[PDB]
């Protein structure tokens, strides 16, 4: 069965490369050395009508929409996914996409800031934290997560499987048929265990540490949805992309 697990790993890696433009390898090549830096209002304007914090938030929303599209195309590649009840496919995407967004965002981050506009720019962490309340608090938890997540030193081949494991989560609210989802996830987990033990002999308990990050991701997502509720009321000027609205509705 090890050959079947390696074949699954390779299939997922190939699909990941096909689906996601700015991979961790490409990001890390940029981040280690050139992007323009956004670190203040002036550089923002040179980098680039509504208030500054809102303009940035709207930018983040459009990037998320592109990510939902890419993640969904990836999901379709996971063997068995499109043979699930379609209601459950939709539920898995609804609840999975944000977890995956924040996982993959860590690839674009270091402790000092985040790559933007396909790796052509870098927005400082300090600048994002400086934004007027409550916008100053959107990205900071993500940076805190990313610093801890990036300390695992995962590569793209590892991430491809981990993201599939997240999508095939049988504990999502509203699933109709949990057992076939868990059957797929069990195979994915076996593939991830093998991939990590192969690729990272220096860290025998990496599998454990990585899976424990799923708890972190869910907390980040919970907190994010809460900050949107706040914004929803008083920011009559924010405008939520209609796709993201679909995801957030009754989440």
């Amino acid at each position: 069965e090890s050959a079947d697990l390696r074949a699954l790993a390779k299939h997922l890696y190939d699909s990941y490369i096909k689906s996601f433009p700015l991979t961790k390898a490409k990001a890390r090549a940029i981040l280690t050395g050139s992007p323009f830096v956004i670190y203040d209002m002036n550089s923002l304007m040179m980098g680039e009508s509504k208030e500054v914090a809102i303009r940035i938030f709207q930018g983040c929303q459009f990037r998320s929409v592109e990510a939902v599209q890419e993640i969904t195309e990836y999901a379709k590649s996971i063997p068995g996914f499109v043979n699930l009840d379609l209601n459950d496919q939709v539920t898995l995407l609804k609840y999975g996409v944000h977890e995956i967004i924040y996982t993959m965002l860590a690839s674009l981050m270091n402790k000092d800031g985040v790559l933007i506009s396909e790796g052509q720019g870098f927005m400082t962490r300090e600048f994002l934290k400086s934004l007027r309340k409550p916008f100053g608090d959107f990205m900071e938890p993500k940076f805190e997560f990313a610093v801890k997540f990036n300390a695992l030193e995962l590569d793209d081949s590892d991430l491809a499987i981990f993201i599939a494991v997240i999508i095939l989560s049988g504990d999502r609210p509203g699933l109709l048929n949990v057992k076939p989802i868990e059957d797929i996830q069990d195979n994915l987990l076996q593939a991830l265990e093998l991939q990590l033990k192969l690729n990272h002999p220096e860290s025998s308990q990496l599998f454990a540490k990585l899976l424990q990050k799923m708890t972190d991701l869910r907390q980040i997502v919970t907190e994010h949805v809460q900050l949107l509720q706040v914004i929803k009321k008083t920011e009559t000027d924010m405008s939520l992309h209609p796709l993201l609205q679909e995801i957030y509705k009754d989440l």
């Binding site: 969904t72 999901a75 209601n87 995407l93 796709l243 995801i247 509705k249």
Partner: peptide, 17 residues
């Protein structure tokens, strides 16, 4: 294809399907 929540997931379903 169609599913129970088609009307409230029209954009996500366009992507998937």
């Amino acid at each position: 294809x169609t599913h129970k929540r088609l009307x409230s997931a029209x954009r996500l379903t366009x992507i998937l399907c």
